[PDB]
Structures are given as structure tokens and as C-alpha cells.
Amino acid sequence: VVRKYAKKITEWPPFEYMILATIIANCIVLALEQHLPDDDKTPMSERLDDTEPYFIGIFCFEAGIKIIALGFSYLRNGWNVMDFVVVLTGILATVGTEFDLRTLRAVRVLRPLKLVSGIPSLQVVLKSIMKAMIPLLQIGLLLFFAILIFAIIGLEFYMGKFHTTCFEEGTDDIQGESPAPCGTEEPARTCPNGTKCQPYWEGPNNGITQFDNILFAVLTVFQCITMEGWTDLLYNSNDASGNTWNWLYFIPLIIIGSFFMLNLVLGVLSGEFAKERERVENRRAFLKLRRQQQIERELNGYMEWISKAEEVILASTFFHKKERRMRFYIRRMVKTQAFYWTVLSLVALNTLCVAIVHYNQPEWLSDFLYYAEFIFLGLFMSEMFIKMYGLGTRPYFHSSFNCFDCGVIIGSIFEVIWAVIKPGTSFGISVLRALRLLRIFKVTKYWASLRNLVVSLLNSMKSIISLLFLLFLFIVVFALLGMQLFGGQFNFDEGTPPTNFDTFPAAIMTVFQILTGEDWNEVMYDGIKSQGGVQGGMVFSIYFIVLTLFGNYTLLNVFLAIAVDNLANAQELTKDEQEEEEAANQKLALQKAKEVAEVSNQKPAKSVWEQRTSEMRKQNLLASNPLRRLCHYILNLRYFEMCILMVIAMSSIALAAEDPVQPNAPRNNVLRYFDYVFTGVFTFEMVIKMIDLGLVLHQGAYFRDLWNILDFIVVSGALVAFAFTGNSKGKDINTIKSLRVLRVLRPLKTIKRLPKLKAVFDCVVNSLKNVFNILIVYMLFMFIFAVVAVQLFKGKFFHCTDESKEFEKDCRGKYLLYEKNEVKARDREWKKYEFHYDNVLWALLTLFTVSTGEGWPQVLKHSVDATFENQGPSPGYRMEMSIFYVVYFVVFPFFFVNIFVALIIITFQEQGDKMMEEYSLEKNERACIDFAISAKPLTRHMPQNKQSFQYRMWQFVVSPPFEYTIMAMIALNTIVLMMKFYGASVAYENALRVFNIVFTSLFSLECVLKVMAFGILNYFRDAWNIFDFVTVLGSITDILVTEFGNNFINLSFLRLFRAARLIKLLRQGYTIRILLWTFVQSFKALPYVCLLIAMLFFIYAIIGMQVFGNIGIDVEDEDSDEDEFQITEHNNFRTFFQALMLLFRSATGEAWHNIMLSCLSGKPCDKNSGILTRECGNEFAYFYFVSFIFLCSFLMLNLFVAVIMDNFEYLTRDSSILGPHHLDEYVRVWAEYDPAAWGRMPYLDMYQMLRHMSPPLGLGKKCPARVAYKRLLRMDLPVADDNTVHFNSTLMALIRTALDIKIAKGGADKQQMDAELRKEMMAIWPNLSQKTLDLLVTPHKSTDLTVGKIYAAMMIMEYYRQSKAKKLQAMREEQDR
């Protein structure tokens, strides 16, 4: 209440500081609360609960004083609204215990957010995040539509199929404790002999995952979209109904909804960041940074000058001057090259010494490393002392690197002292000295870019801390919410899961794990199970859905913005410094040449990012031996090259048909002769190429180009393999096996032979070359982390089969395994964990597995349970080790991966596009004038002959009621498809069938009506309309098949035609349709980039088939050890399609490390292999899987960046500046004015033409007439003898006027700029007919009556009329006196 203006006093700033302190204290109090099951309470919680009155009183006082002093504008600000609603909720919850409302205790989680309300900088940072996040809403709409379509399809196909397991024969009891879907026929999974398939098993994941309602379907589809547990669903559906067709539903689901959506998100975010960079404030900040850097460079030069000049000022301790002379000498010695190189050598030696440490290093090695660490510490301390005494204490402290070395020395001393005081743990702090190896980049040319990146990072260091703090605040808020909702309710009968919400650290860990997206579905299952189950706890899935959906995209936005901004700033600084040093060199040389006058290349092609950024900057600033020749002839012969390509393709296809399981299969025997023929052909090709190229240092010979060496390796391996089996094959079979494996290089023999495929491979190679230095930095940081992890967790990853025994000596004999309803005797084994930290290599592998995201929660549990060396784990021993894995996730996967993505996006090179030096104005005019060339008016039927009946019904068809009725029926049919649910009555199903019949009859009637209105040819000349006709036919066919009965079921793919009506709704989402069409066109434009990935998958599938193809799958252990036995009947290598499925599953990143472990050596072989010993599987699996993951990720990233950069014009468009996107509205309206659409429209209506559409192309309905006529003058559009203007001629004038293409201000200059434009268009479009050129750029005759002349005359007449009218008024007002 305002209360007028009586004695109201402002508040002093430490009042606000006290409010912040109160908020922090309340956050601490909320974080110090523990939740216990049922009604138990800790004593500390009871004390903590009584502090709420004080906090609510302070908040009430703040709200009251602010509202009384401000005289509510309190509710105008959103932050004040949040504070006010928090205050009211708290005071209502506290006062009045009616109904025991705890839902109003959940509002307290939002109190941490009041810190942002207090601090305006956090408000600014949230504004920055949210503004960039707004464009993603259109992507979310696409995601929702795709999820809805796939949920409808799954509900239609997978309805209630997962409620049938292998029940016991005699009784209705589950056969085992791991139920799986079953069927009652061969295609499905048949139950064992003593079991039967009986209905209503609960279902996978306790029934949470299923397709029963439209809600379960949507949740299931979303979970599959997050790439979590989708292979489990694929395997369950394969068990339930066979594996023939389920892949067509699951793999395209992943491809469309997880990779395509990610590509769209990356493109939109990149466009938003590019548009944000060129804003005025960011430009001013960058200019300030660049000027400061120039100042620092000049200062450094002058400081070197003064240092050298002052050093030459020279010309016991007090008596002798040696105390200063020797300091001068050592200061001179410091800057010598040797004093730097030897220090780097010692740093490298220390790095090697700390890397050597492993689990069972010999005792002499331990002593040597102890003494070596002491000696290295002493030597580095001596280097510190010499540096400080030579250069001076203050100059030493001023340098940042000297401070870093001081920190490392102090850390080493602290580690030594702590190890002496408290033996048991070591942090290996000395390994951080390896960061000094980054100084080696100074001798290379890569130092400038890295230094600029570091400078840009250090400049915007507050804006990074603020972003991290806001991320932490959101994590804290969600952790508090999870504690309020679930809390102590996770005490299941089988034990509390490690990912619980009981305590605050556990809540933070769980929320972080959900944000990273790893095993979030299991936590969701536990959360749903806590409040009942599938019956009455399914509403709590919203928490996890919101958490993961927001976390993925917020992490992506927050880190990609940082990476892109800093890398772009670094690139621009580097380019500017290079150009300014070049300019200074030429200017200095020119000025110096005046004194000696008496005696007397190409810049690198700019990236698409840089070109578009420069264009946007300019646009914004505008606002203000006979056989040797015979063989040479043969290799140039067309039939030969086509035959070689055909033979290579046949070889690749043949490699995919072999049988890994059975060497003596009838198909392998046949394929052997194909191998003979292919080897002979390749021998002939190689020998003829040898004849032409030669061998004796011709410098253009065979062995100079790598592809020739590859071909030689392939053919020589084939011949050697044929040679060894020459006699006695049983001597060595691995030898012939490896040489057979060498055949997989045949697919690669097309990269050189297909010019475009080589043009894609070279682009991939350039992408590798651009990111090499960041890769080196990434490897160095990962090496440091691996060494630290080795120090922390060396030998601590030993466990026992019996958990009660801690040491090795106790883990011998037999122990009782108390399982549900059965007690089993097992053996005690002192096993090591699957992924440990024993040496640097194992640590690197484990950290790579963690970075890929798979199985890192298990590694975290093992790390926090590690007690001591050679000792069993104890749960919750050292919970502080979670900081290691938090920092690792913050550094590598969140920051370095996004740096890689940003660098590849920024430094992308446009494919082809010739050299474009001759062309001048094509930055944005290309597509505009090209669309002007290829512009076609929209055509309606318009016969005009049959006005009596045909015209009326044509009007009826294309009319707002018709379109709205179609949309309404589409929406209702969508709802009808959604209302299917499991367990409905027969009447419900019959009603749904009748509704479907009615809707399809309505659609058929509209098809008939449009056919009548337009004519069959015009009906069938519009792709959407053929789609409608096909869908109608499919629905009719489905209905006829249903009503027929019996016969063949004709599957259910006809019902996909029923469900495909949703695509018709895309005709209203203009922005969405344009986005989808642009990205699909870009994907179609690049066919070989999508072929390189296919080739990679092919090669790796063949390698897997030939290496791991014979691993046995029949064996199932007593416990089955699901973790390690991941090679089953669903995830095997036995055939090409199964190998491809396994490769795709690994590419999606789902327990690939377990597959890698399962493919190692020592595994049992298959019965039909022919090997009777456990000698199947190789240690090659490590390299196989790691290289596959890296290469697949790189190739998908390259494809995504290629598509984004191809669409980068649309992604960075601006509404104010004309683009080809707005041109279609013009086209539509122009076609509309003329029903015939002959291409000529009267010049009078052209004024109404411009006013209806919005600027920049149009003028707007509010445009003044004088402003309207002024633009018309610049168009100079000629008028035809029939007083009409041509469609194409108007468009070119419209485009030209808005973009100022060559636009001269008048005079003879106009003819020259028309002449130059004509030559450029002919140079770009040689096939453009002269008639079209004269139509687009009209030859200017003086006699021609243009539109500008017509409008100029009326203004002159109007000005003359107005001037005359004023003159009569003037001659009258002056006469009345």
C-alpha cells in the first residue's frame, strides 16, 4: 500500500547484505536436514525445525518494508513476486496445522533462488542463458510431435504384448527370478519343456515400461529417445514377437528423434551464438580486449628495450661488489636457451618418473622413485631460488608462471609432510608440473591461437564463474526437491539403493547422475516404486522427465556458449594481430626505404563462420618400351576402371556373406573361389600399375602414394595366406586367420577411385588437422588425471565374492550364498574389479569409459568404497572421492568436448564453390537473385468456363471452412487414435472402429471433392495431395482387409497409413516446416558424407565378424553374471546384421564397455566352431571398441557440422534484412491477386501490392504514402504497353532495392552498373537465356515509361497542387489586413 508519502525511509546496503546472509543460512539449514523412513526424526532435525519462524519473520519484515516504501510497484518485478509468494506460502504453512499440509513445505526448495534476486549479476547471466534458450521451443515442438507419432505407432503395434512369461507348469508361479517375455510359436521365445506361457506377467521393469495407454507409450518413447534402456526394449520385443521387424521401429526411432534432434539443436544454438556475437555490446567489449592486447604487446617490446638498456648501465658482502656482479651474471644466465631447455627436460623426467608408478612395482623401484622425487623437488626448489635471486623477488612474484611453480613446490612440500604425518594416501601433486610442457608450443606456429584462447578465457572469467554458480544453484534446488518428494522412502526390502535422496550429498550425487543422463531410468523406476508402484505412483515420473530434459539442453547451452564465444574471440584476435603485424611491416619498410632511396601471397580461405560473421557485421553497421605405353593406355581405359569398381564392390559384398561360426560351412567353400578370383584380378591390376609407374626412384612411382602401399599390403597378404596353406594347415591357423582378416581393406579401395568420396575423406582429414593441438592438450590433461587416479586408487579395487571377508587370506574355501527362497554354497574368490586404477594405462581406459558415460556410477561406488591397499571395500568409507569425478565431468566431457565441437564448427571449410575472386557482390545476393531467376507464380485451376456449377464448388473447396474442417477432423482422428488402451470392452473397440470408418469416409469424400474441383492432373501435380490420396487408399485397404476376415492377416503396416495423418498437420507450422525442409534438403545435398559412416560401420562389422564371430552364446552361468556375459543370442557377432546391430548399440553408448570385456580372450567357443578349448576372443577388443567409439563420434560430429554449416545462412537470418525466405510470401500474394496468374498485374494494384505485406520487402499497412512513393522511384520498373508489370521483373526490382545491389544514385553510372551486373550474371549462369536476362535486368530506353516516372509525375502534380493551394492561402491571409 502506498500510504501517500509519510515518513518513508530507504534501506542501507548492509541491510541487503544481511538479507543475503539470512538466505545463505536458510540454505545451510535446509541442507543440514536428514530424512528417515516412516515417522522417525533425528534429534538435530527437531532443533532445526524451530528456526523456520525466525527466517519467515525476517522475510516478512523485508517484504513489508519493501512494499510499504515502494508503495505498490512491488509485483511488477518477477523476483519480488517470487519472494512474495514464498513468504505467503511459508506463513500459511507455519500458521495453522489443519490437514497437516506438507505440500507447502515443498515450496522451501525455491528459497535458494532468492540469491539470484539479491544479486543482479546472476539476473543478467540468467537473462543471457534464457534469451539463447528461447529459440529451442520450436525444436521442442518437433520433439513432442515425433514422440507422439512414435508413441501412437508403438501403442498400435506393441499393445499388451509384454504380459506373458514362462509360468510354471503345475502352478501359476514364475519359473525363475528373472522373468522375460515369451510366446507360443517359433518366431517368439519358446519356454522350456516344464513351463508354459500364461497370461498377465507384471512386465519389464515392474510394468513401468510398456505400451498400454497413450501415457505409458509417451514415457517409453521418451526414455528410448534419451538412449537409455532402448536395447532392453528391443530384446524384450524380440522375445515377445520375433526379431524380424522390431528394428524398423526402434532404430529409425533413435535416428529420427535423437541424432536429428541433436543436429537441429546444435544448428539453432550455433546460429543464435553467431547472431549474438555481432551485437553492439559484444563488439565493443571485443574491441576493448583487442586494444588492451595491442597495448600489452607494445609495452612488452618497450620493457625489453629498457631492460637491455638498463642492464648495461654497469661500468665481505658490503666491501666486494661480487654480491651484485654474480647476481647480474646469473640473471643473464637465466634467459639463456640452455637454462630453459634443461628445465623442460627435468620436468619431462619428473613426469616419466611419476608415470612409472604401478601396483606391484619392485622394492628397488620404490626406493629409486622415493629418492628421485626428493632430488627433483630439491632441484626445482634450487631453480626457484636462483630465479628469484637473479631476476629479483618482485619480478619473480609478478610473473604468473613463477607463481604457478611456487604453488607446485608448496603442494609437493605439503604432500611430503602429509604423507609423513598420515601415511595411507597420496595425491601425486607433483604431476601438475607436467603442465609446463605446454610451453613447447612457443617454438611452433600454434602458440598464437592457444595464447589468444587462454587470454579470452581469462578475460571472461567472472562470466564463467557466474554460469557455474547458477548451474550449482539449480542442482541444489533440484536436490532439495528430490529430498522433499522421495527422501527416506527408498528403504526397500532388498536394501537402500546407492542413488538415494536421504542425505544432501547423496541427493546432489543422484541429481548430477540424472543430469549426465546415465541410468536415470533406474532412478526413475525406484522413485516410482517408492510411492506404491505402477498402480498409484506414476505421477512422480514428471520430476525425472523435467530434470533430464532441462539438464541435457542447459548443460549443452551453458558450455557450448562458453566454447564458441572464447574460440571465436581467440580466432579474431589471432587474425587481427597477424594482419596488423603485416601492415606494420609494409608501412615500416616503406618509411625506411626513403633513407635508402638514394642508392636504389594468398590469405587462407575464410571459413563459413567468418564469412557470415563479416557479412552480418557489415549489414549491422549499415544501420548506423612397348608394354610401358600399352599398359598406360589400359589403365586409362574406361571399361577397365568400371570393371575394377564392380570387382571391388563384389568383393565387399562377398566379405559380408561368410559364416564366422562354421569354417566348414558350404557357403565358405564357395566363397573361397570368389576370393581366388578377386585376388587374381587385384594381382593383375597391381602388376600393370607397377609396369607403368616403375620402381627405380621415378619420384612418381608406385610406393610414393599411400593408397598404393595399401593395395600392395592387401594383395601380398592374400598371396601369403594362399602360400601358407600350401602344405600342412594345422601347423599355424592363427597365421592364416590374420591374413584372412587383412581382406577387410577392400572397401577402402573406393575412396581414391571415387573423386567425391576422396573429397569427403580429405575434409575429414582437415577436420582432424584443425583440432590437433586441442587434442594434445586434452591428452595431457587426461594423463594428469590418470596419474592422480593411480595415486589415489592403486591396489584398492580388490573385492571378495563373500563380502564379510576383508583380506586375501580369509577369502578361501566355501561360503553360503543366501538367495531368495534358496540357499546355495559357492566359493570365495579374491577378484579385482573390472575397471580399476592400477597403472597409467588402466587409469586411462577407465577414465575414457567414464567420459563416454557408461558405467561411471559403478566406478564412483568402487572409488568411494575403497579402504586401503590389498583390502576389501567398506561401503561409504571415503565419500569425499566424489569430488574427483565431479571435477573430471566438469573438465573433460562438459568443456573439452564442447571445445572440439565449437572449433570444428568455427573452422569449417566450404565444399567446392570454386574460387570466386572474379565475382564482387555475391555475399547475400546469390540466393536472392537466383530465386528471382527461378520464380514461378502459384497456379489455381481457374477455368472460368463453368461458372454455373464448377466454379461454385471450387470456391467451396478452397475456403476457410473447408480447411478448418479438415484440421478439426485431423485433430479428432488423432485423439481417436490416442484413446486406445489395454483392457477395454468390446463396445469400446467397436466404437473406435466405427469412428475410424467415419473419419476415413470423410477423408475419401474430400479426396473425391478435390478431384472434381481441380481435375485429375491438377489433383496429382501436388506432392501433399498424392500423399493424401495414398493415405486414403491405405486406410480403405486396411478396412477391407479387416472386414474380410481370416485369409492372411496382411500384417499391420496398413495401420501405419492410418497413423500417418499427423504429417498433414505440418502444413500450418510455417517455421517448423521450413526448418525441417531446409535440413532435409541439406542432408540430401551431402550423400557421400553419409556414405563414409556406412563404410566405417561396414569395415568394423566385418572385422568383428572375422575376429569375435565364434564366441559361444549357449553358456549361461548359475548367476548368469549379466555384467560380463553380454554376448548373447541378441548381441552376438554371428552374422552381418547382428554385427551391425551391436555396432549401432555401441555407437548409442549403452554398456559398450561390458561388451568389450565380454569379447576378451579366454572365452568358451561355440559347439560348431571346431575348437574344443576355451580359446575364443582376443585382447584386440580394447583397441577395437575404443577406436570404433572415437571414429564414430568424430564422423557423426563432422556430418552434423557439415549440415549446420550448409544451413548456416538460414540459421543466422534476420527479419529486418531481406532473405529468400520472405520471397515466398510475396509470391503467394502476387499469385493470389490474379486468379489466372498469367504473370502480369496492373501497375495501379502494385501500390496495394506493397502495403499488405510486412517490411523489408513490403512497405506495411502503416507506411506513409510519401515513403511508399520514394521507394518506388528507386525500382525504375518499366511498364508494358498494357499498363501491367511482369512478375519476375517486379521481384528483381524488389530484391535489388532492399539489398542495394550495385544501386547507383543516378546518371550514366546506372548503365555501367547494369552492364557490370549483366556480365556477372552471365559469368555465374552461362545457361541463362538472353530473353530471361533482359527480363530480369531490363535494358533501359529513355522512351520507356517506368513506374518511377508515373509516381514521380503525381508527386510533382501533388506538390504543384499543394504549392498552388498554399499560394492562394498565402495571397489571402496576407490580404485580410
Ligand X SMILES: CC(C)CCC[C@@H](C)[C@H]1CC[C@H]2[C@@H]3CC=C4C[C@@H](O)CC[C@]4(C)[C@H]3CC[C@]12C
Ligand Y SMILES: CCCCCCCCCCCCCCCCCC(=O)OC[C@H](COP(=O)(O)OCCN)OC(=O)CCCCCCCCCCCCCCCCC
Ligand Z SMILES: CCCCC/C=C/C/C=C/C/C=C\C/C=C\CCCC(=O)O[C@H](COC(=O)CCCCCCCCCCCCCCCCC)COP(=O)(O)O[C@@H]1[C@H](O)[C@H](O)[C@@H](OP(=O)(O)O)[C@H](OP(=O)(O)O)[C@H]1O
Nearer to ligand Z, 775 or 890 (CB): 890
Using CA atoms, how far residue 800 sits from 794, 803, 831, 832, 1116, in Å, is: 17, 6, 6, 8, 22
Candidate list 124, 584, 887, 1315; residue touching ligand X; CB under 6 A: 887
CB 79 within 8 A of CB 123: yes
- Residue 145 or 962 with smaller CB distance to ligand Y: 145
| Residues between 1147 and 1176 with contacts to Ca ion, criterion CB under 5 A | 1150
By the rule CB under 6 A, 1211 interacts with ligand PS1: no
Question: Binding mask 1086-1105 vs ligand Y (x if CB under 6 A, - otherwise)?
Answer: --------x--xx-------
Amino acid at position 821, single letter:
N
| Among the residue ranges 471-479, 491-499, 685-693, 928-936, the one whose residues contact ligand Y01 (CB under 6 A) | 471-479
Binds ligand Y by CB under 6 A, chosen from 431, 648, 1140, 1186 = 1140
Q: Which residue's CB is nearer to ligand Y, number 213 or number 907?
A: 213
* Placement of cell 518485478 in the chain: 77
Q: Residues at the annotated binding site?
A: 228, 518, 854
Among 231, 535, 1145, 975, smallest CA distance to 223 is for: 231
Residue partners of 1256: CB distance under 8 A and separation at least 6: 1215, 1216, 1217, 1218, 1222, 1298
- The CB-of-1212 to ligand Y minimum distance in angstroms stands at 24
Residue 193 binds ligand NAG, judged by CB under 6 A: yes
User: Which does residue 153 touch among ligand NAG, ligand X, Ca ion, none (CB within 5 to 8 A, set by kind)?
Assistant: none
Q: Among residues 392 and 505, whose Cβ is nearest to ligand X? A: 505
Residue from 118, 853, 1242, 1260 in contact with ligand X (CB under 6 A): 853
Q: Which residues pair with 165 in a beta bridge?
A: 198
Q: 146 touches which of ligand PS1, ligand Y, ligand Y01, none (CB within 5 to 8 A by kind)?
A: ligand Y
Place of cell 507447502: 104
**Residue window 525-554: x/- pattern of binding to ligand PS1, with contact defined by CB under 6 A:** ---------------------------x--
CA dist 1164 and 464 (Å) reads 53
Q: Smallest gap, in angstroms, from Cβ of residue 1117 to ligand X?
A: 23
Q: Segment contacting ligand Z (CB under 6 A): 144-152, 179-187, 433-441, 876-884? A: 433-441
> Using the rule CB under 6 A, is 1217 a contact of ligand Z?
no
∠ CA 548-1157-1101 to the nearest 5 degrees? 85
Within 718-777, the residues that bind ligand Z by CB under 6 A are 777
571-578 own/partner pairs: CB under 8 Å, 24+ apart: 571/449, 571/452, 571/610, 571/906, 571/907, 572/286, 572/290, 573/289, 573/290, 573/293, 573/452, 573/455, 573/456, 574/448, 574/449, 574/452, 576/290, 577/293, 577/294, 577/297, 577/448, 577/452, 578/448
Q: Is 882 in the site for ligand Y01 (CB under 6 A)?
A: yes
Cα separation, 1002 vs 1010, whole angstroms: 12
Per DSSP, the residues of 186-246 read: SSS-PPPTTEEEEE----GGGGTS--SSHHHHHHHHHHHHTTSSHHHHHHHHHHHH-SSSS
- CA neighbours closer than 13 Å in the CB half-sphere of residue 639: 2
Give the residue from 370, 381, 367 showing the smallest Cα distance to 413. Answer: 381
The residues that bridge with 168 in the sheet, in sequence order, are 195
Task: For the beta carbon of residue 440, count every other beta carbon within 10 angstroms.
Answer: 12
Among 64, 194, 252, 1170, binds ligand NAG (CB under 6 A): 194
Is 304 within 8 Å of 396 (Cβ atoms)?
A: no
194 binding partner (options ligand NAG, ligand Y, ligand X, none; Cβ < 5 to 8 Å by kind): ligand NAG
Distance spanning both ends of the chain, measured CA to CA: 61
- Give the separation between CA 940 and CA 949, rounded to whole angstroms: 17
Q: Give the Cα separation of 1340 and 770 in Å (integer).
A: 51
Which of 1149, 1177, 1256, 1278: binder of ligand PS1 (CB under 6 A)?
1149
Total residues interacting with ligand PS1, rule: CB under 6 A: 21
Asked if 144 interacts with ligand Y (CB under 6 A), we say no
Count interface residues toward ligand X (CB under 6 A): 45
Query: Positive or negative, the Cα torsion across 332, 338, 341, 344?
Result: negative
Return d(Cα 694, Cα 700) in angstroms, integer: 8
C-alpha cell at 477: 534446488
Q: Which stretch binds ligand Z (CB under 6 A): 51-59, 449-457, 1327-1335, 1346-1354?
A: 449-457
Strand, coil or helix: 808: coil
CB 559, min distance to ligand Y01, A: 10
Min dist CB 1205 to ligand Y01, Å, is 29
Q: Closer to ligand Y01 at the Cβ: 378 or 876?
A: 876
Q: For ligand PS1, what does the binding mask look like between residues 566 and 605, x meaning CB under 6 A?
A: ----------------------------------------
Q: Is 44 a binder of ligand Z (CB under 6 A)?
A: no
Query: Do 1108 and 1228 meet the contact criterion of CB atoms below 8 Å apart?
Result: no
Within 664-723, which residues bind ligand X (CB under 6 A)? 666-667, 670, 674
Cell of 816: 553360503
Q: Of the ranges 756-764, 845-853, 903-911, 1091-1099, which one interacts with ligand X (CB under 6 A)? A: 845-853
Q: Residues 820 to 879: which contact ligand Y01 by CB under 6 A?
A: 839-840, 876, 879
Q: Which helix (H) or strand (E) holds 1285?
A: strand 1284-1286
Nearer to ligand Z, 302 or 1070 (CB): 302
Q: Judged by CB, which is closer to ligand NAG: 1116, or 1309? A: 1116
Closest by alpha carbon to 470, among 120, 888, 116?
116
* Region of 227-235, 888-896, 1203-1211, 1258-1266 interacting with ligand Z (CB under 6 A): 888-896
Residues 6+ apart with CB under 8 A from 577: 293, 294, 297, 448, 452
Which neighbouring-strand residues pair with 817? 824
Three-state secondary-structure class, residue 577:
helix
Q: Which of 256, 353, 372, 432 binds ligand X (CB under 6 A)?
A: 432
241 binds, among ligand X, ligand Y, Ca ion, none (CB under 5 to 8 A by kind): ligand Y
Contact residue for ligand Y01 among 54, 305, 472, 1020 (CB under 6 A)? 472
Residue 650, interface with ligand Z (CB under 6 A)?
no
Nearer to ligand PS1, 631 or 903 (CB): 903
Q: Which one among 557, 566, 851, 1290 touches ligand X, defined by CB under 6 A?
A: 851
What element of type H or E holds 814?
A: strand 814-819
The answer to the question of residue 1141 lying near ligand Y (CB under 6 A) is yes
Q: Interface with ligand Y01 includes 883 (CB under 6 A)? A: yes
Phi, psi of 164, rounded to the nearest 5 degrees = -150, 105
Task: Identify which of 704, 766, 715 has the alpha carbon closest to the alpha carbon of residue 742.
Answer: 715
Residues within the interface to ligand NAG (CB under 6 A): 193-194
Residues within the interface to ligand PS1 (CB under 6 A): 226-228, 262, 517-518, 552, 556, 853-854, 897, 900-901, 1147, 1149-1150, 1192-1194, 1196-1197
Residues within the interface to ligand Z (CB under 6 A): 300, 399-401, 404, 435-436, 438, 441, 450-451, 453-455, 457, 461, 464, 562, 777, 890-891, 895
Residues within the interface to ligand X (CB under 6 A): 213-214, 427, 432, 516-517, 552, 555-556, 650, 653-654, 657, 666-667, 670, 674, 784-785, 788, 792, 851-853, 880-881, 883-884, 887, 891, 893, 897, 975, 978-979, 981, 1149, 1161, 1178-1180, 1183, 1189-1190, 1193
Residues within the interface to ligand Y (CB under 6 A): 145-146, 149, 153, 157, 241, 243-249, 251-252, 256, 1051-1053, 1056, 1094, 1097-1098, 1135, 1137-1138, 1140-1141, 1144
